[PDB]
UniProtKB/Swiss-Prot annotation, chains A, B:
Organism placement in taxonomy: Bacteria, Pseudomonadati, Pseudomonadota, Gammaproteobacteria, Enterobacterales
Top-level division of the source organism's lineage: Bacteria
Transmembrane segments: none
Misc note: The conserved amphipathic domains in ShlA and HpmA may be responsible for pore formation.
Species per Swiss-Prot/TrEMBL record: Proteus mirabilis
Subcellular location: Cell outer membrane
Role according to the record: Bacterial hemolysins are exotoxins that attack blood cell membranes and cause cell rupture by mechanisms not clearly defined. Cell-bound hemolysin, which releases heme-iron from erythrocytes by interaction with the erythrocyte membrane. HpmA requires HpmB function.
Encoding gene per record: hpmA
Stated name of the protein: Hemolysin
Amino acid sequence: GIVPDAGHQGPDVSAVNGGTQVINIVTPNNEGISHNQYQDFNVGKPGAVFNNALEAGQSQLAGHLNANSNLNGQAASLILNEVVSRNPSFLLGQQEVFGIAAEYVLSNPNGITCDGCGFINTSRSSLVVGNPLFENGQLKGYSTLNNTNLLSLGKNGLNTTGLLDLIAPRIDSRGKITAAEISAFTGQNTFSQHFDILSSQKPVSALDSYFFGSMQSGRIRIINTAEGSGVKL
Amino acid sequence: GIVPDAGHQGPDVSAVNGGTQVINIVTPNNEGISHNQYQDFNVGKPGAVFNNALEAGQSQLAGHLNANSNLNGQAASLILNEVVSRNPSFLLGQQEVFGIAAEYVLSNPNGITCDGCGFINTSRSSLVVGNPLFENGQLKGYSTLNNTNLLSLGKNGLNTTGLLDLIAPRIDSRGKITAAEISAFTGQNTFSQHFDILSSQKPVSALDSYFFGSMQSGRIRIINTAEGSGVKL
């Protein structure tokens, strides 16, 4: 399911009970960013729990858990999950931040597919079909340049009580998206770490996005930078 | 087609050639707002031309036209068209601002239906299923409170090179919307004159909007203030 990278940014991964995965995220940097790298990142119906706790307590999906000692007393402000292989990601269940609420990012330039997935105890969750941009260990933004892959949301939809960002060369959504706010940025873009669009490529051929399904949110923004490409619905 | 109100804010309306309507809008106020009132406001395939010109010249839809002497030398910054009857509006063709480019608003609380309509030489065009709010002759905003009527966009769509606002208790769109930016505000709201949402009612029953069709625009925003009401697509 979730397979950590073998290097220093691979978190400790285990699973409990019916297979709910538990990820002790790696120590956050001075900016509060826990940068976790994976060979595989997939979530099933049992869900997954990111341990961002400074003290032991009760998680929603995985029962009682100890504090995450990797935190060294400072919880992450952003939990950044980066797939560094060629494997695409499938999210079929809930992902919970246990402990201190945090921002969540999954970056996978090979593609991300949600179907009945969701986020618990996140202020903001972003799905990025692209790569994070680092400079001297500091997160500077994200890139969907030179990428034509797809963020796909299935008929069982996606739900969160927090903010949601969907970032990909193209997006295809067929189910209900429930979020406090929905921000969808399509095309080939350079982003700041707050998802400001800094610049955009013109794709070699059209990159069309399809939102079908529905959206249950008080604020929706869709920005498509691929001139001549459309938002179908 | 277009029938001006009999009072002081009824503009002078005529038609040329195959029936293209020509509206000499009324004198703008000190804010630059030309507030035109109508018993009926409908546009057919021949289109309509709002004369906002300080000098004679060539209009796209209606041929050669003189300056609009109602302007008294100052072109309108906003051309506000208000339907004051119970009649809904049907827009089946192009509306052109002749002369100085301006903002355009059509307000009709009984409902507005676009089908193959469009806007020429407008910086921003807004369709408002609601009423303008005036205080001592100054435009203070718009209201969709206590209104459940529909802004409908037909299969032949809507096109403009400028900005577009769609404001209504509910919106049902089945065609392609082409605009520099699209802003859709649904629900029962009090608006500022720049379409800031100042407050919102909770509807007695759900006010659902349906965007189908497509959107060809680099920036789309959809804001639905009716909690529990959805954006279907």
